[PDB]
Amino acid sequence: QEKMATNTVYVFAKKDSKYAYTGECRSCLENSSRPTSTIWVSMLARGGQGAKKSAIGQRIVATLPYIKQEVPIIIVFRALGFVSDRDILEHIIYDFEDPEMMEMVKPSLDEAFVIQEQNVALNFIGSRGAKPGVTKEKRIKYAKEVLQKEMLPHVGVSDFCETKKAYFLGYMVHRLLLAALGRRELDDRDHYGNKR
């Protein structure tokens, strides 16, 4: 039986949906009883305005497993213990001498400047989950559980795997930015290097 290759980042174009370019990674750790859990890193298209008098740029948003709402990328990066915008931009864009990519990621960075703490970021992660939280308590733990054992199991499931997961998520966002720029071509669903 054919299947899409697991643990590999792909950039596709849902030309009919509200997303310009959508990234995905059907992450599945080898020798793990749990099945694969696909995480999507999408960019809201709305090429012009975001149907507002203030929403100028496109905002990158992530579809995490067991979470029903479109979580922003910066929220997840803050929830991983990276509070500074400079550090997140280091993990996303590896060169600070190409202002065009930084300008493209600027609207997504400026969506979530309200949330600055890891506690608030994790609380927003726990909001609108497949299993909704009770209060501030038992919802911080559920969000921590989701970020620990649901998204990206192939980069590791452990307490010290926060930075490795942050690096791989930054790679997913960076590849999405490259696809949005065209510096790397889009990925084919029928290329047999993308199948198992």
């Binding site: 290759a5 080898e30 047999y192 290097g193 198992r196």
Partner: protein
Amino acid sequence: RKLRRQMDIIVSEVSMIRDIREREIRIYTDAGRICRPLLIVEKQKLLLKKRHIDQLKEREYNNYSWQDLVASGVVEYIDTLEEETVMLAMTPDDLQEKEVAYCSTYTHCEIHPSMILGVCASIIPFPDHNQSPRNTYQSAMGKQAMG
């Protein structure tokens, strides 16, 4: 690659892909990838020398198998990812002699083009002289002939 042409540490099935345009190098060890053996072209010379054929004709005597040729660093398995970053020679009698040069930078050589076909498309005499729908229909009928 030097370790894969010797089977020191890395298994022959494992594949390395160096993305050169974008600075990446990915090594795949998954279970499910689909590969096929290809000759290795060092210089515009094949590594399949005459001595390999001499030791390969006398099987059941020298115990020189296909796995020994894989261990000799002559053939290796190339999967679909690695085919995007390989210069594949079709046949050696045409694509290693000097001419008005096409690329002169071959890395692998196809063993024989007839091995691109399946089991039922291999029983067709002169399948390239036919039309492709006819080959497909014969492939359907070949699994139905009495015998």
